[PDB]
Amino acid sequence: VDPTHFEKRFLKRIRDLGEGHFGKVELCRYDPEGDNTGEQVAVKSLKHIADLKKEIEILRNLYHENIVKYKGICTGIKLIMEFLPSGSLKEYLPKNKNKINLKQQLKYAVQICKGMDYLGSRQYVHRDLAARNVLVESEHQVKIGDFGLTKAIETDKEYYTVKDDRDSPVFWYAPECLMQSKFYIASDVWSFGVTLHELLTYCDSDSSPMALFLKMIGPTHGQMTVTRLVNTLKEGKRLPCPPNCPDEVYQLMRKCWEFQPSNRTSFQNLIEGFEALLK
Ligand SMILES: CC1(n2cnc3cnc4[nH]ccc4c32)CCN(S(C)(=O)=O)CC1
Predict the structure, then answer these.
(1) Top mutation candidate among 135, 138, 144, 195 for ligand 1, by most atoms within 8 Å of CB
(2) Hey, what long-range contacts does 233-237 have (CB within 8 A, 24 or more apart)?
(3) Where are the domains of the chain?
């Protein structure tokens, strides 16, 4: 018997956890005994097969306490992951403000950075780092929860050149990704800076990177939105300091948003910077 082999017949659909354009994740019960006592699992399916197969192979081989656990496959193929009942920071933060203070926020930040630095050391760029993809394991632990856009960087090359970019999360993206479709580890650092802004605003929809940028550049530009975004970033405009966020935290955030990738902070430097603020 293979414990990572999940039979489709026992995999009971409960609800949607999220989706992209081509894939979806659902909460399911794997219930082989049929009595509703089976384990809850997160199941990723296509709504492209080769891409999901690559994602499975990446995730199966990542081992870090801040990276969501692979459980198996169902075979067309589905990825089976651990289900985290507290959900993402998007669900958790708005419901738990009273519980979660700046110190815990900075601990989550460190954990995301550690997860990401592990990923980078395996020569991967993530390309989709955002609060909605950060899972809450407990009040004291988070995990990177999705790897749908994750790509290997070729050895002795510094970046991945993207071809499919229709559904890019532009408001989380560094200027080089917007302008040239080149994706660096430094590009993941930029995205982390935005993700940190979300964490500091408790994922409030009205303070979201999209809502805020569209206020800055104008919401009615259609196909010209990305050029206007790039232009606004060229001018040196950035997301503003979240309420109640100390300038020292905001400055670490700003080093994530240097225009040139070469001048950005790294995940190692962020971890040092946050750990210093904690003790
Ligand atoms: C990470 C995820 N999610 C939300 N709550 C979760 C709870 N447990 C999860 N296990 C794996 C993913 C996962 C969860 C939310 C966002 N998506 S996506 C990229 O399709 O928009 C996947 C599922």
Answers:
(1) 135
(2) 233/175, 233/178, 233/259, 234/175, 234/259
(3) 1-83, 84-279
Solved with: X-ray
Q: Is 20 annotated as a binding residue?
A: yes
* Pocket lining: 135 vs ligand 1, CB cutoff 6 Å: yes
1-83 under CATH 3.30.200.20, yes or no: yes
Owner of token pair 């990923």: 119
Among 209, 214, 271, which Cα is nearest to 240's?
209
Hey, what CATH class is 84-279 in?
Answer: mainly alpha
Q: How far is the CA of 129 from the centre of ligand 1 (A)?
A: 12
Q: How far is ligand 1, taken at its centre, from the CA of residue 234, in Å?
A: 33
d(CA 32, CA 36): 9
Measuring CA to CA, how many Å separate 132 from each of 63, 203, 263?
21, 9, 27
* Cα angle 266, 269, 273; round to 5: 135
Mutate to test the pocket of ligand 1, among 21, 25, 56 (most ligand atoms within 8 A of CB): 25
CA dist., res. 28 & res. 144, Å (int): 20
If you take atom 9 of ligand 1, which residue's CA is the nearest one? 83
Give per-residue burial for 16-49: e unless 16+ CB within 10 Å, then b: ebbeeeebebbbbbbbeeeeeebeebbbbbeeee
